[PDB]
Design a binder for this molecule. Structure first.
Ligand SMILES: [C]C1=N[C]=C(C(=O)O=P([O])([O])O[C][C]2O[C](N3[C]=NC4=C3N=[C]N=C4[N])[C]([O])[C]2[O])S1
Length: 518
């Protein structure tokens, strides 16, 4: 793979690549579609619109939008103008967005109408620098100053040339959370999604022009950003986007060609999603779908889920591990080489290290801390030098995982080194859940650990000490957590206990809870 030139604008690169297929569908969702030509026009018109309102090169804008054909226009349009889009989760609270607006110093916000209310709350309570709010598909009247995304794009002539960016300049940000502290702004360069899209999308998955890509993982996830934007645009594939929550019925409807007259040939999701679909009553048969490749990421794929998917569809699930910091997978099974119970082999282009307790090599079969050296690594966490020093160490990126290398060169996941839990393939901090539970007036203490469910998938499990003298029923506690935590963070069960095992210094002995002692 030939490195990108030093003068390089990722958005312009993706546009140029597809000037050979102007009338092929680039993106299609429930209500709209965009050829590569139409996408290029609207991308460059949005870039001009953003510059016209005074957003200058290297400044950030907040991109808070459901998956839809407007999403890649917003993302590539900012990048084409040398403006840095900060692409964020659509299921967060006003407080979360308030912090992101201040931390990013976003100068404009591109928001889906359905998300305007939470953004309104975030703008009102924050010390933001937002100059303009641009609402894609408004769901309510427009407040003074705000503009409709389609009118905004339609009102400016396409920018004549891209910003003269370098390949190592920041191009976009994603946020990722550790076990405590604020979400971390992961800064990715113009080069990084070129490397992931060439090394993984093209050379590992073998995506191609006649593919139709469909990702249960949303575009604001690093995984989804590759699956359904950078990978397909790199090979000219057509991408199906879906705004709504990715339930089995929603997914099946798309698999069967219920949207845009296209049937997906490549599907991406988390193992939890695959388990959910395999259990659905209306699982399609192979003759009904056009899938040729099924990708999985976010959490380890239990062998039995892959085996059941293979037995039903005649297709393996290809399990790879990536991270927000590395942007896409660096360890992966191959489409024609799958070993269930492992994450496969290093992606060519990435060097992998397992380090022991002195930082040195570990022997095959023993766990070590995983570190990755690859050309797609994020450069830093914006504004957090301490965590950046901890993570990005002179060419090597600490993943937070432990892995075991097998005799055939494959790698088996062996857990985290930080307490973080991956539930439905999404980061969850047990300390957040604990902190939420102890604000219930009936809870004295709480400890949360991860437990494998019947399918081998990790879920939170809560141990709660009731506050003496307070009626506390499981049902009232479930309702308490319903409106305070996103559903994927719900504890699978809650065990009420009279005490928690504690050292003798006030620390909960969480491993005894993992061990089943209570
Ligand atoms: C491609 C891709 N990108 C991204 C991803 C992810 O997931 O990211 P985040 O959120 O940052 O996270 C990371 C983590 O998670 C986990 N995983 C993933 N994948 C996997 C896993 N594990 C196991 N296996 C697999 N496949 C870990 O922890 C990491 O570090 S993807």
């Amino acid at each position: 793979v030939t490195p990108p030139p030093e003068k390089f604008n990722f958005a312009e690169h993706l546009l140029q690549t597809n000037r050979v297929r102007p009338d092929k569908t680039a993106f299609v969702d429930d209500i709209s579609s965009l050829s590569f030509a139409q996408l290029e026009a609207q991308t460059r018109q949005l870039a001009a619109a953003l510059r016209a309102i005074g957003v200058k090169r290297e400044e950030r804008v907040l991109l808070l939008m459901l998956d839809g054909t407007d999403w890649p226009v917003a993302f590539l349009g900012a990048i084409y103008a040398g403006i840095v889009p900060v692409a964020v989760n659509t299921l967060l609270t006003a407080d979360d967005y308030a912090y992101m607006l201040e931390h990013s110093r976003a100068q404009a916000v591109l928001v889906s109408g359905a998300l305007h209310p939470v953004l309104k709350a975030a703008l009102t309570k924050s010390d933001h620098e937002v100059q303009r709010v641009i609402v894609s598909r408004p769901a309510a009247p427009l407040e003074p100053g705000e503009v409709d995304f389609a009118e905004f794009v339609g009102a400016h002539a396409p920018l004549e040339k891209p910003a003269a960016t370098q390949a190592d300049d920041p191009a976009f940000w994603l946020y990722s959370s550790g076990s405590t502290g604020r979400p971390k702004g992961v800064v990715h360069t113009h080069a990084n999604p070129y490397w992931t899209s060439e090394l993984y999308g093209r050379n590992t998955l073998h995506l191609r022009e006649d593919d139709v890509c469909f990702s249960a993982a949303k575009l604001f996830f690093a995984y989804g950003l590759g699956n359904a934007l950078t990978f397909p645009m790199t090979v000219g594939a057509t991408t199906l986007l879906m705004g709504e929550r990715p339930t089995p019925d929603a997914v099946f409807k798309r698999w069967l060609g219920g949207v845009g007259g296209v049937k997906p040939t490549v599907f991406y999701g988390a193992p939890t999603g695959y388990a959910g679909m395999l259990a659905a009553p209306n699982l399609p048969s192979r003759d009904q779908v056009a899938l040729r490749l099924a990708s999985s990421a976010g959490e380890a794929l239990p062998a039995e889920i892959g085996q059941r998917f293979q037995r039903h569809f005649g297709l393996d699930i290809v399990d790879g591990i990536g991270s927000t910091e590395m942007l896409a997978a660096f360890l992966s099974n191959l489409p024609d080489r799958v070993r269930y119970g492992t994450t496969g082999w290093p992606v060519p282009g990435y060097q992998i290290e397992l380090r022991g307790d002195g930082g040195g090599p570990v022997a095959d079969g023993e766990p070590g801390d995983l570190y990755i050296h690859g050309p797609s690594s994020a450069t830093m966490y914006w504004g957090n030098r301490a965590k950046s020093r901890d993570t990005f160490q002179g060419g090597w990126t600490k993943s937070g995982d432990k892995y075991v290398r097998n005799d055939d060169g494959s790698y088996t996941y062996a857990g985290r080194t930080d307490d973080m839990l991956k539930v439905s393939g999404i980061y969850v901090s047990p300390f957040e859940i604990e902190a939420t539970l102890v604000q219930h007036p009936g809870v004295l203490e709480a400890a949360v650990v991860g437990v494998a469910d019947e399918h081998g998938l990790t879920k939170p499990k809560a141990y709660v000490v009731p506050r003496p003298g307070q009626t506390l029923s499981e049902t009232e506690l479930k309702t308490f957590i319903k409106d305070r935590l996103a559903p994927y963070k719900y504890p699978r069960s809650t065990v009420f206990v009279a005490e928690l095992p504690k050292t003798a210094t006030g620390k909960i002995q969480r491993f005894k809870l993992r061990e089943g002692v209570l």
